[PDB]
Amino acid sequence: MWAFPERFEGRHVRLEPLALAHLPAFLRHYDPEVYRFLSRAPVAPTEEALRAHLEGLLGEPGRVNWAILFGKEVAGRISVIAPEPEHAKLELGTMLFKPFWGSPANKEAKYLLLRHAFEVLRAERVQFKVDLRNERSQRALEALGAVREGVLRKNRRLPDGAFRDDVVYSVLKEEWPGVKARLEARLY
Amino acid sequence: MWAFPERFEGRHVRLEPLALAHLPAFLRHYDPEVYRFLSRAPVAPTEEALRAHLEGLLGEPGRVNWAILFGKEVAGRISVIAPEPEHAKLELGTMLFKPFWGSPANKEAKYLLLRHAFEVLRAERVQFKVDLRNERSQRALEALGAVREGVLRKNRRLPDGAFRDDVVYSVLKEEWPGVKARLEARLY
C-alpha cells in the first residue's frame, strides 16, 4: 500500500486529514453549485444532507481525504481516489467552497499531492475526472496542463435517473516537471 | 444487484458459468498471443500458470464469467466486469482461444450478453477496454459499432514494469438497436 502524509504545509494552504470535525465548515459554506458536478451531492441544504455527503467521502474504500486550510478557514477538500500501487496510478479530485474559488487553494493543494505522488511514490499516472458540464474545472485542468483523454459517455447516473458524461484527464510522470513548473510560476 | 442467466443458448455457441472444470480447455489451447494484451497473463505455458490465471478470473470481486462452448469445445470466455447497477453500466470483455478466432463465437457471445444487459437489465452503458497494441480487438469493436472514447495512457503496469495504454470503447442503450442489427446480419 502507498503511504501518504497526514499533513502538508504549503505557502498558501496546509492540508490535514479530513474528518467529521470538519463538518461545520461544510455547513458554513453551502452553495449547490459547489456540489452539482459531484456524485452523491448533498440532497438538501441541511446538516443531515451535508453530514451524509461528508461521511460518504470518508467511507469510500481506499479513498484518502484531506481538508484544505486557507488561513483560518477550511477552504475545501482534496482526495486521492482509488490508488492502485500495482499500476502506479491514482485519481485526484478536489472541491473548494465558493468563497475560495480563484484563491491559490486548489492549485497548491494539487501541487502538494501531485509532488508526493510523482516524486515520492513514483506514480506513473494521475487521473482527474470531471463532469462534461463542469466548464470551470475543465478550464482549470487545461491550465494545469493535464491531457484530455476523452469522454466516458453516460458514465454516472444521478438520483433523478439522468445520466452525466465524465471527461477524463491525466498527467503522466514524464509530464510532471512541466506541470510542476507552471504551477510554481502561478503559485510562487 | 443485477442477476444474469447461468446459461445462454445461441445458434452457434452456448454459454455456461466459467469454472475450474474448464481448465483443461485452457491447457489444450495455449498460445501466448491469446493472453498478451490481457492483465495477469499466464506467466508460463504451464498448468500452474494457467490455473492461476483462471482462478484470477473467478476471484475478481463482482466479475461474472461464462465459458463459451462452440460445438464440442470450450472456445474461450466472456466476462461481465465491474457491474454497477446504480449507474446502469458494466464492462464486457472476451478472450477466445486461437483456433476459434474468426469463428462466430466472439460475436454471438457478445450478442447474447449485450442483449441481456440492454434489453433486460436496462443498462445505459456497456464499455470495453483493450490494449492500444491489440489491433485485432480494436478492429473487432469498430466492426461491432462501439464508439472509441479515448485512450487511458499508461493505465496498466505489467510484471516487468512496463506500462500499457487502454483504449476505451462503449455502446450506449440508444446505440444498441444499431449494434444488434449489425450483429444479427453477420451472425444469422
Side-chain angles (χ1 to χ4, degrees), chain A residues 85-89 124-125 147 149-157 163 168 170-172 174-175, chain B residues 85-89 124-125 147 149-157 163 168 170-172 174-175:
Chain A
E86 297 299 296
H87 292 295
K89 68 179 182 177
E124 181 53 47
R125 170 193 174 78
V147 174
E149 291 176 334
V151 176
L152 303 182
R153 305 174 303 152
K154 303 203 157 37
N155 197 51
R156 286 171 293 112
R157 197 172 67 188
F163 288 96
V168 177
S170 69
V171 171
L172 301 181
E174 316 89 86
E175 300 172 333
Chain B
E86 297 299 296
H87 292 295
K89 68 179 182 177
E124 181 53 47
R125 170 193 174 78
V147 174
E149 291 176 334
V151 176
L152 303 182
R153 305 174 303 152
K154 303 203 157 37
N155 197 51
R156 286 171 293 112
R157 197 172 67 188
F163 288 96
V168 177
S170 69
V171 171
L172 301 181
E174 316 89 86
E175 300 172 333

Side-chain angles (χ1 to χ4, degrees), chain A residues 16-110 112-173:
Chain A
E16 70 182 6
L18 188 67
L20 287 179
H22 291 110
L23 184 61
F26 287 79
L27 309 181
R28 290 189 292 276
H29 308 289
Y30 178 73
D31 181 328
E33 187 181 349
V34 167
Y35 300 91
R36 62 184 295 198
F37 307 117
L38 294 175
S39 65
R40 293 195 281 175
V43 302
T46 68
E47 168 169 326
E48 291 92 341
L50 284 155
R51 180 178 306 267
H53 174 76
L54 177 56
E55 292 171 328
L57 299 176
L58 306 173
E60 178 180 332
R63 191 170 178 138
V64 188
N65 301 283
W66 291 262
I68 297 164
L69 311 186
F70 184 61
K72 189 176 195 60
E73 317 270 294
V74 172
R77 55 88 181 155
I78 177 165
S79 307
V80 162
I81 295 168
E84 291 188 57
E86 297 299 296
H87 292 295
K89 68 179 182 177
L90 61 82
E91 177 171 322
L92 199 61
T94 65
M95 189 203 78
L96 284 299
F97 299 127
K98 185 69 82 57
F100 307 96
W101 284 11
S103 72
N106 203 335
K107 295 191 291 293
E108 193 171 48
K110 293 193 162 81
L112 293 162
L113 262 296
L114 290 167
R115 189 172 61 160
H116 182 80
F118 289 124
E119 298 181 23
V120 179
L121 299 176
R122 297 166 72 175
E124 181 53 47
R125 170 193 174 78
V126 172
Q127 74 166 27
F128 302 85
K129 200 172 276 169
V130 296
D131 196 305
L132 179 64
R133 296 167 309 171
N134 192 349
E135 298 298 338
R136 181 179 69 95
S137 292
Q138 288 170 62
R139 285 185 298 256
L141 291 171
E142 293 162 356
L144 173 73
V147 174
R148 189 189 178 101
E149 291 176 334
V151 176
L152 303 182
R153 305 174 303 152
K154 303 203 157 37
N155 197 51
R156 286 171 293 112
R157 197 172 67 188
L158 304 177
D160 63 16
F163 288 96
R164 296 298 164 218
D165 299 342
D166 279 327
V167 181
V168 177
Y169 288 82
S170 69
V171 171
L172 301 181
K173 165 182 296 311

Side-chain angles (χ1 to χ4, degrees), chain B residues 18-110 112-163:
Chain B
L18 188 67
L20 287 179
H22 291 110
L23 184 61
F26 287 79
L27 309 181
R28 290 189 292 276
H29 308 289
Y30 178 73
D31 181 328
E33 187 181 349
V34 167
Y35 300 91
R36 62 184 295 198
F37 307 117
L38 294 175
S39 65
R40 293 195 281 175
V43 302
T46 68
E47 168 169 326
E48 291 92 341
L50 284 155
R51 180 178 306 267
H53 174 76
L54 177 56
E55 292 171 328
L57 299 176
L58 306 173
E60 178 180 332
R63 191 170 178 138
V64 188
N65 301 283
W66 291 262
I68 297 164
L69 311 186
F70 184 61
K72 189 176 195 60
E73 317 270 294
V74 172
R77 55 88 181 155
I78 177 165
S79 307
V80 162
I81 295 168
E84 291 188 57
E86 297 299 296
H87 292 295
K89 68 179 182 177
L90 61 82
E91 177 171 322
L92 199 61
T94 65
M95 189 203 78
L96 284 299
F97 299 127
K98 185 69 82 57
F100 307 96
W101 284 11
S103 72
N106 203 335
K107 295 191 291 293
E108 193 171 48
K110 293 193 162 81
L112 293 162
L113 262 296
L114 290 167
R115 189 172 61 160
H116 182 80
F118 289 124
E119 298 181 23
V120 179
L121 299 176
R122 297 166 72 175
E124 181 53 47
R125 170 193 174 78
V126 172
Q127 74 166 27
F128 302 85
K129 200 172 276 169
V130 296
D131 196 305
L132 179 64
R133 296 167 309 171
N134 192 349
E135 298 298 338
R136 181 179 69 95
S137 292
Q138 288 170 62
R139 285 185 298 256
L141 291 171
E142 293 162 356
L144 173 73
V147 174
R148 189 189 178 101
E149 291 176 334
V151 176
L152 303 182
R153 305 174 303 152
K154 303 203 157 37
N155 197 51
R156 286 171 293 112
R157 197 172 67 188
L158 304 177
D160 63 16
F163 288 96

